[PDB]
Structure formats: structure tokens, C-alpha cells
């Protein structure tokens, strides 16, 4: 009867950055979008719908982004008779006895001849920042985490999290009131979005529906297990095929938690990042080698470890500059080892710091 | 038209899921559609026409999906004068003295400005939200089994039957009254659709027109070879070309029956699927190897056989997770061996269980 | 000119299937279309314009299919003032003092809000047969034989003739009055269309303008030698360039006649097709091998030669089934030898029987 | 005298085919178009603007093809007040006290709701109906010769000149009053257009402003040196970059002159083309071989030299049939040697005849 | 807050070529565009917005190129009530009591049915020069220098500066009053634009906000350190990610200064460019070779060293022509060595001369 998930709890807290994970088919996009229409229609505000890849937007049904059922549930009795024409891709409806119309053209949705929704893709939006969106209060990131099942080969954009942040500034031109919604159908570690936020996924946090951080709040949406009527043939048929049943809870199936271990010796190499020094230490073992990733706040006790510097300004003394060509030779193999859970991190905090560094420089990795 | 086959017998039985096989050119889709207009017009209900490949829908002439002949035979004495305009894809007709219009625009057909028929393709079925299709009582899947002659290379969607079920669930939002029609011009084993239903095609079931199961009914429609008027040149020309003539009776030409043999020895590997354990056992022979595919209800007697688990959550203890990248290597040859009839299956029931597993994970 | 060729002679004979070859620029498409308008306009009948490849239809000018010059020549004095609007793809004209309008949208042409012409492509026609073209009296297959000059690489559909035959049956359901027009700018052997008809192209048949078979008629159009006004500079320039001049007579340049020889020995393999047995025999010669393609009506004297069966139902006993993966292994090299004029055929009738078999099972080109 | 080029001199001669080369920035297209309007407006005549590649037309601004300035210079005081609407591409002006409007929509420009200018691309030329163009008196081919600078990689259409001739015949239907204009910003040998015309570019012809041939006239337009005002900052900045300055006189920089030498010995192979026999003769030299391309009218003295025939119909007697797929292997290396200036040609007449043969069958594959 | 940068100072000086570097987020394009409207509306003048790649223009929002705020800040009280319709991209407003409308369709913006702004891409600009813009006073090049971080793969157009210069002459035909603006978010050496202008970037010039050349003036805008509101979550998040924070001051982070050294010995090869001869000299060293790029005013003392000449017309006698195939064999490796700072340059002036040569003939 009532929509399972609502964005209200997230809106009530002070934080303005919300991350919603799991519960695909629950209409997260339906409810997040649904809440805003109240604002978009009469507060002279617009919304930007963000997708990672430009291909995803072209396939998206823009005529159905705002649907009659959506208007009817959020406005209810206030919503009047609705007489849309699908050939012309125009919707006419009346609210409060006042006529309004929605028409979807190109990548924009128009309400009473005013643009309320912008459809832009991160792969294309990043390439031009001269664009300017005058009034935007809501940015929504849908399917923000890659799902291997839906898409066999999908690669996160290069230095993705930084590209997104720069896009925020262009969309949000020093606006006090701005909201960001990130919606993921599946949640797992080792993505750049988690690295940027700094959130580390753990089963305990999954058990607790709500987790609180300083900058953002992440809420976990789990679709209630419903007694399935076995008199219905379609329900029985879905039950016989297990691959169908398992799809519902696949979101939190695997979180890709990484290994943790402590190693006393000093790293083979150091790289200075974020007023910090990252080091990798190798321990020789009979079968091969064992790799340990560490973070050092200071260089005390590490006189002779070579230091690589990514940034030109911060370089000083003997540290060697790190160029695009150089970082591949030294760190290509180390990055591949990082992506897979083949390495030991001293603590979860160090894993986040390393994630920020790795996902900034990750590139290509196609057929390698 | 509707003379040979009617869906009325299927509607008369209790089951709500129907599989119709064979009898191409008999207007199966015409009559399933034909019966439903009765509801679509006046019971405030709609229908969805489902095709596997988006190409099948784009090329389909949607304005003629509902034709005057159809309207006239199903409404009969009620049907009045009919004045259609083809340019705007509008039909004007009166039933019971009430004027109505059917307009087809884009992938939807409207009856009195209400959508009664939706045209959607299974390849695109993903990213279709339930709000787009409010009221649907009928889903019709046409040409559900691949035909080798019509299309040279056509591949069932990866994990297709699961894709279909999600489409069922999205379209049918806990609706008690829902009907599924699966219409196939040709019937043969080794497709995912038969596997999903759990139906195994056999000549005995083909001779008996109707087979009932717990969830569905499958009815086989075969048109008897009709005397061809040899005065018409087009008919005369078709007779001279044999590949065309054999196409008429192509539906049940080959049912792809698979080999069956039993091997006592224990399997080489185990993979846990569907609350069960599937194993492949190899018997060495002078020329090479002989393959036996088995199903184990339980692990009794199989202490140390390695177990691969498709699902991460259910995995436990010594079972090693099987991810898609690591999976290809192990089961590539076994999947090739399954698709080509090169392995021995213990029984048809195990063959069906293996079909579910294979077609869920198949990749070309 | 438009008055050069007329389909009238073809219509006068009883046969309903016509194959027109050669004479590029003679307006075969213009006149075949021209004859029908009387029917399309006033007999509540429609026409289907069929092309092999979807590329041919998308590039085709939908608006210019029916032109003012066309309407005027076939209707003449009956044709009234003509006031077309080029922007919106609309034509308004009056016939017998009655106003009519022709509009072209997407792949259809409409006359008085009724669809008279359908544009559909054979490559896409196979995917869907449930479509309903309600009333069709005319089906036109244009540029039915591939010309390498116009199109460097063009591939016939796999099992093409059956795709076409299925399309005939889908378009023409229950119609006593139906006409098929096949129009080729160039005529040559070794195409699947000729194989399906059973017609074998020969220089003698080209000399006689008209040939009659049981099912169809083939008429050969050769453009009469025309006096070239030298005085015109553009005419003088075209003469200097031979590739331009040779294009005019390109239709019958090469008819791809195949070699014929008889070999007594029995074949290496047999394949059963059309209640007959086709065989290939190899004769070893010092330089290499010599291939002979034969047809046997019966198995008498061929006890132990292996027999391949294309169709599963008819297969029996010692015959080994021929699957798609199998025929490529056995017959890929033999099919290559057939396409290139490298084998000896016993007679033209066996060549046709072999052509039907090859083009039914032919491998899809690599790409 | 008159620093501004006009097509009047070209129009005065009898010939109807004109090739204009060089002088980029002189407004060749501006004046060729400009001269015709009197006919287009009041003689019920249309013009066709032809470009090799569709890309050139799509980027082209069709509205400004006919501009107010163009109208004023040719019509002058006779031209009245002009109040055009740029949004809808509708211009408003009166001539001789009669109001007129020119509206540009899609690939056509309409004058008083009548089409006077057609914009069509040679790449897209296929499947255009002759009837579509009832009356066309002017065909203008702009940038007809490829310029290496404008486009890093640019390819002439396969068998282009034959493609052009088919398009000429379709547009023109025994029209006595028909004109062909070919405007090229750069002139050089070894293109199919020169091969088709039969024109061989030579510096003497460039020094002589005007050249007449049987079918056409070629006029060379050279823009005078204009003392460049240094006061403009843009001009001084251009001076520092030399690659920019040389572009103005780039047209006649390189004419691709081919080597000429005569060789007495008889050829190695013969191929029959155009009722003629082409031959390639090789002279052995210490470093390698020397190639001489010759043309023979008759086979006298050439008894046993093999003859290849491209066309099956004309084939006869001892000639061995050569098919398009087989033809390339035999002549691939010889064709490569022709395109790069590495062979000796008997005369310019033979060089053109070889060009016609090569450009008809030259093909690239991968 | 307040526009950190305004174009008025640049407009005040005589020179007509301005190069603006750095200060991302300052609305350089916002203020340059804003200043011109006074001219575009009432001086019967137009403007051309230049982007390197056509991809950059298609993604650009033509309706938001001119925004109500920009209108409001530059005209202020003069601006009246504004009620635009975004559906058709038509704005209506009144200035000085006179009603006007600007409608943006395709790649053009029209003011009172007159085109004031043209959107063209440099990659496509070459192929069509016949296009004639009757009145153009402003040409603006935005993001003129490539930024490696924002765009993964970005190529300077081959011979870009000449392509731009040819475009200048076509757009500006005999116009005395013309202004060119070049706005770059990042400033670094080794781009063709700096080479074409002849400006050599140096940190000393970065400290001084304004640098004056003869042909042009270049102004450097660095966005002053502003206290970041740490109540805003987005600002708090950016501080944690260092790569994001550096982006604002990334412009002048690295200028790619090249090494400079003089070598007396004569070069291996000479290439004549701009009535001068560039030479590369190799000194054999144990690890490998050391490359020195030099400029010679005359050939005295270099009688027999090979000379490559780029232009055929100027080529004469012993000079060897430099063709597309020939320039790949000799100079492919030398160009790779130039792009990376692996070579020694005699002076900064010679480096610019080598830059003119390299970026004119470089191929990717």
C-alpha cells in the first residue's frame, strides 16, 4: 500500500549528502525523484540526473521519468484530471485547479515551458565545464556503483571522484541549499566513490540500517522478505528457478572486504600523498612474496627509502618526480595487486587513504 | 483465419500459463490477441506483446496488429461500420452502437485514448519500471523458440528465462488475474525457455495434443499438409524449391533428443546449484573420453570432491567460490560439450536441471 | 526515355512473374510503378517496393518515387494542376477534376490517407513474417542481381530465395490477383535468384528479347544504339572517358557461363537433395586435380559411397546427418570451387540443381 | 586594371566547361554565383552547388551562400532596402520595385518559393532522380582539387570522374544552355579530375593566364601581392609564423610534374584499354630497374607479347582475361609505381591515358 | 561573492590580443561574454565562440550561454522584468523600455532576428571557409590550452595555430575593430598556442600579474586563497581529497620548463625554418647519447651537413625535400624527445623557434 522506502529520514538529518545502497526494484529513483517535484514545480528549481556513462542516458526513457502514477501518489486528491498525449510526448494535468503541462524534449524535461530536469552523463559532462545550470538544488547519481552482472565489462572513468566534484561546482554555483543523492543498486568495496567519501563497507554497518559520518549519511535499503503465495503459478514458477530468487538479495551478497595485517620492516618504496607517505613493504616467503601496504605520518626512521612524489609543487629535496609515464612502470603491478584482495593493509583507515591514491591514477587496464 | 486454432480451450483450463508450439501460419497470435479485445476494450485491462529481439518489434507493423478482419469476427453482430485512416494510423468503428477509435503511435496501441497493447522487446526489457505499465492482464511471447531457417544466427539472451521472470514480476504487480501465452512456431529441446518451465519435449507428448503440468499447459498445434493449388504460379514455384517446402512442416522436424547413459563411478567435479549438487564424471575409453552428467540430491559418499558455488552468500567452508572470470576456464569445454549432443545424461529430469544451470551462465 | 520500355507486353501474357534484366537508365522501375497507379489509386490496392539490403532503402529517395513527370505521362490530359510542397513532402493534384494528395512518411507512401506503397528490405524481412500488408497486388524487386561496379562488396542473403519465397507468402495471403516484378540492371549466372527460378542465362536468350517458362517470363532490355550529338561539349567529354561509356552497356558484359564436361567414374561423396543425389568426382591429373559435379537420380551402382542428408526428417539408415558445422568442413572448399568457375558440370540442368543446393547452404562471408 | 576576379571573361568564350584554379580568398564562388542571379531570378533557372564530400556541405552555411553584400554589388542602386530575418533564414528585399523573398530550408534555397540553388554532395550523389532537377543551367564544383593543408587525409572518390559524368547526365537532359564550373584553390597533376578532362598542368599554362582546349577552358587566378599593413596586431603575429604566410601562394607551389623519357625496346606486358594497348617496359640497370610506360596504337611488331583485357566482351583470340580481383596483383606494384613519380612516360598524352586507366581501377582495401 | 577578474583592464590597452591564464571558477568566460552584449545588441555586431574540438560545442548548453544573472549584473537597474520560455529556448526582456528577444536554435543565438553569437569548432573550422560572417567583432577561445586531468585523451589539432590564424582571416575580413580573447584554465609550455604567439612561460612572469608583448598582452589571474566555509558539506568533502583541492591552483602548478645548455660542436642534421636553420647535435656519452637543439643564423662553417626544407617552393638545389614519409623516419624519434624534457636547448628563444617547427609538423 505505502511505498517501502522514503527519502525522509535522510532529509531530516542535517547532512546534505546521502548514499542509498541496495534494494533495487524498490523505486529509490521513484521516491527520490518523487520528493523533489514539490520543489521543482513551484520553487523555481531544477534537477540534474547523473549517469556514469553517456550510453546509459540515451537508453533511458525520458518520457517516463515523470509518470502519471508518480504525480498521483505524491499529490493524491490535489492532483486533478490528467489527459496526456503520448504521440506528442506532452502531459497535461491540473493541480489545485490550475493547469500545468510537462513535455520531454531531447535531454530536458519542461514543466509549464520551464526546464526542471537535466540529463547529463559524467563521461561527457566532464569534458566541458563552461556549461552552467542556473537553478539546481538536486543532483542524483543513479547506479553509481558498477554491477558486473548487468554489464560484463564496465570501467570507472579515470580519476572519477575528482571529475564528479568539479562537476558539483559547475552545477552548484555557490548555492547554500543544494542536495546530492547517490543511489546504488549493489554495494561493494574497492570502488572510487567509496574512496572519495571515505566510507568502508562492513557487515556490521549492513546489519544497522543507518550509518552516520561527518559529511554524509549512508542508508541501507533491504526489501522485506514476503511470504510467497504458492497458489499463484507465476510465483511457483519463480520459486523453481533459484537464479531468479537469488537476484533479489544479490546487492549485499559480496562486499569485497580486504585483508589486514601488520609488518614491522620498512617499505621498499615511499610515495608522498596528502601530507602523508605511503609505503609498500615486501616480505619474502617460500612460495613467493607477501605485500603489505602501510601509511606513515612522518619519515622519521626512514632515511634511505626512495620517495616518489606525484605532485610537482610539493616536490622537495631528493624526492623524484612522478610523471604519467613513470607511475606505470613502478606502480602498474602494485595497482593490479591492489584492485584484487591480494595485499595486506595495516588498518581500514590506511586502505581508504590508499584507495584515494590508487583510484586517482588508475587507467586503461584493458586486456592486461 | 481463426478456423483452425482457438485459445478458448487453454482459457477454459485452470492453469494461467500456456505454451503453444507448432502450427505456424495458423494465426496463433491472431486468435490470442483476438480473444482478448473483449477485455481490453471494456474491462479496463491491457496487454503486452513480447518479442525476443528489438529488431522483431521495430520491423513489426503496429498499425495492423489489430485489423478490421479481427475486429469483425470477434465482435460479429455487434460490429458496425468501420472507417479507418491509414496515414494517421487511426481506426474508427462502432460496437453496440458506440463509436470507438484505435490509434497506434510509437510502441503503444490505444483504444479510446487508453493503451491496450504494449510492444516491448526482451533484449530491452531491462530498465523498464513497473509504473510505465499500470494494468496488464495478458503477456504474449511470440516466436519464443529460435528458428534456425528464418534467422541464421540468433542467440537466446544470457540467462534469458530469469530476464523474462523479472519482466513478469514488473508487469504483473501481485495481480491475481494474469495470463502468459508463449507461442512457438517450432518446438525443440536445448532452449532456455523449455528449461525454465521444466518441460522436456518428447514425441509421445507431441502425439497427445495437450500436456498438463502443475504450473502450465503446453498444447501442440500441427497443421495437416494441405493440397496446394498448382494453377497459381507462386504455388508452382514454391514446389520447385525444396528448402521452402520443408519450411512448412519445419516445426517438429527435429526435437534434439539428448543421449542417456548411466555411470556408477563418482564425478570429477561438483558445482552446487539450485539447492543441489551437479557433477560431471568422465569414463576413459581407448579413442578418448566419455562424459556423464549427473545430479546429486546430497553429498553422502562425496566427502572430498571439490564443490564450486555459484552464489557467494550460500558458499561455506571448503567450497570455493566460482566467479564468472574464474568460471569460464573450468566449464567452457563442458558447456561446449553440453550444447553439442556429446555427453550422456542420467535422465531427462537431470538433463532439465543441467539445462537450467547451463543456460543461466552461457556466454558466446 | 520513359516511352522506351513498357511492361505491357509482359502483362499481356498470362504469366504473373516477370524478370527484367539489363538496360540501366531505361526507367524499368519508372514504368513498372507507372502501370500500377491506376490500380493503387482507384482499386483499393497497394504495392510493395522490395530491396535486398536495408542500406538500399534508407538511401532511397522516398519522395521521388512518384514524381510529377510520372503522374503526367500515364494520366496525361486527366492530370490537372499540380501544386506540391517540397518542405513537408506533400503533393496535391487533381485527377478527372477530383483533388487528391500523396504523402510520404517513414517507409510508406500514402494516397488519400491510404497506404499504396510499402518500402521493406529483404535483409530485414526475414526477422518478421507476422506483419500484415492487407492488399498487395504488386511486388517489385529492384536491382535484384548484384552489380560489383555500383557496389564493391555486396552479399546475397543466406538461403536468400527461401527468405524471398516466405516473404511472398507473407505479403500475398489468399490473393488470386498478384504480380511479381524482378528488375536487374545486370544479368549474370551464379546468383541465387536465377537458381530459384531455375533460369539459366545464355547469349541466345539475350538475342531473343523475350523468353517464356512455365512459371515466369524473362524479358531482356538492351538500350538501342543512340545517335550522340557531338556538338554538345559534355557529350564529347563523356566519350573520351571509357569507364563512363562502358557503364551504359555493362549489363550483359559477362554472363558467367560455366564449363561442362562428363566424367564416368563414380563420385567421392553423395549428398541427397530434392529427392535426388548430387555427387562430386575427382580425376587426378599431373598438374593437380579435375573436379566434376554430377547428379544421380538413383543409388543403383553406388553401394558404399557416403551419403549426406541436409534434412533430418528424411534422413535414414547409413546416411550421415549434415549439420551446419559439418557441411562447412566437407563442403566449404567445394562451394568455393563452385562459385569460381573451377569445376565441370555435366549439363546446365545439373548446374541449376547444384546452384539451388549451394545457395541454400552457402556459408556466410567472413568479415 | 581590375584587381577583382569576374567570370565574365570565361562566359564570353564559346566553351561551356570552365576550370578555375588558384587565388583562394578571391571570392571565385562569390562571383560565379553572383553573375548568375539575373538568370536564376528572372529566367526560371536553377544552380547546383557540388562538393566532393558531404562533410564540406554540412559544415557550410547555406543561408549566407547568397548574402546582402553579394546582392548589392551586382544590383547596386537598383537594390532596395533589405530587412532579412536570420532566425528563419528569410530575407526581404525589393528589385525593380517588386518585393521578393529568399528562404533557405534544408539543402535547397528558394526564391519566391521556387528553388534556384541546390546543395548536393558527390559522396551522396547516388540515387538522385533526374526529374528532381527540372531546369539547371549552372553546376559549380568548389575546391574540386584536394588541398593537403586543409585536410590531413583526403581521398578522391573511387572512380570519381565516372561518378561525376553520371551525375552530369542525370542533372542535364540535352539542355543546350548548361554550364559547368570547377573552382580549385590549388592546382596539381595526378588527380582524377585532370585525368578525366585530359588537362596536363604546366608552368607555361600558368604564366599564360588563359588556356583553351577542345572541351573546356582553364583560367588561372593569382591574387596580387598586397603590401601588408603592419599596424594590425593580427598581421604582425601572422608574420612571425611563416607557415601561415606561405599559404596564400600555396596554390601553384607544386604541380607534380612527371618524368618523361623515351625507350625504344618493346614492352614487357600489354593491357588493352580504350581501343588502345598500354605497355610497361623495363630497362635493367646496375642499381635495379628502370620503368617506361608507353601506349601503342596497334600490335604491329608485338607478336608474342601477352595482352590482358579488363573487359570480357571485347576480349578475343589470344588475350588472357583479367578480372578485377586478379587484375590488381599484376598491376598493383605497377600502379604504386605510377602514383609515386617513379616511371618514365612517353608523352603527356600517354600520361593522361594512363591516368584515366589507373584512376578507374585504383582501389584501396584492408 | 565578487567577480575576481574583469576584462576592462585588458580592453583599456591598445593591443587587441589578450591571453588569460589561470583562475578557474572565476567566470572568465562569464565576464568576457557579459561585456560584449552592449556591443552585440546595439552596435550591429556579432561574436564567435571558439572551442578546439567539436565535441566540446555539442555538449555546450546554448540556452545557458547567456543567462539572466549575467544580464542582471552587467545591466542592473536598466534590466526590466524577464519572463523567458526555456521550452523553445526563447528569452524576452526589456531594456531601456524597449522589448527584445534572443532565441537560441542549433549552434546560433539570434537577437531580434539577427545573429549575435556563432558557435564553431576549430576541428571543423578548416573544411569550410567559404562561410562568411558579415559583422564579427569578437572571437573567444575558451579552454585554449589542454588540461591533462580533465580530459583523458586530448590532441592539439595538427598545425593548430595556423588553422586558427586562417580562421581569423576568414571571420575578420578587412575589419579594423576586432578583438581576440584566449582563455586558458591552465598555463604550461609545450603547447602550440604559446609557441605561435611567441610567449615563453616562466615563474617570474607568473608572479607579475600582467606581461606585455608587442603583438599581444597576457594577463595571469590566480584566484586568491579564500576561507572555505566548513559548514558546507561539499566543501568539507573536497578538502579530504587532495587531487580536487589542487585543481583550483593546478593552473600554474607546473609550467614544463625545458633544460637549457649550449653545445659548440656542429649538428648531425639541419632543417631550414623561418629563414633560419635548426640543428640537432648529439654528443656520445657512456649511458647513451645527449641531445642538443640549436639554432643557427647562417650556414657558415656547416657546408656539408644535410639540410631538410619543409617548403617545396623555397627548396632549391642541394636541399632535400621533407615529405610525409621522409619526416617520419628522420624526425619521429626527435619529436618524441622534444615533447618530453629530454633535450638541451641553447636558450628560451630557440626553444620557441623549435616549438614553432615541431607543433607545425607534429603528427599523432
Numbering used by the authors:
A (entry chain D): 5 to 372
B (entry chain E), E (entry chain C): 5 to 368
C (entry chain A): 5 to 371
D (entry chain B): 5 to 370
Relevant lines from the article:
Two crystal forms of gp11 were obtained: (i) tetragonal crystals belonging to space group P43212 and (ii) trigonal crystals belonging to space group P3221. While the three structures described here were determined in the absence of nucleotide, the active sites of ASCE ATPases are well characterized and can be accurately identified. Two distinct conformations of the Walker A motif are apparent in our crystal structures. One conformation binds either a SO42− or PO43− ion in the canonical β-phosphate position. The ion forms hydrogen bonds with the backbone of the Walker A motif in lieu of a β-phosphate, typically provided by ATP or ADP, which explains why the Walker A backbone adopts a conformation similar to a typical nucleotide-bound ATPase configuration. However, because the structure was solved in absence of nucleotide or nucleotide analog, it lacks any interactions mediated by the α- and γ-phosphates, ribose sugar, or adenosine base. Thus, this structure likely represents a conformation with mixed characteristics from both the apo and nucleotide-bound configurations. However, the crystal structure of asccφ28 gp11 ring reported here shows no such helicity in the N- or C-terminal domains. We suspect that we do not observe helicity in the crystal structures due to lack of substrate DNA imparting helicity.
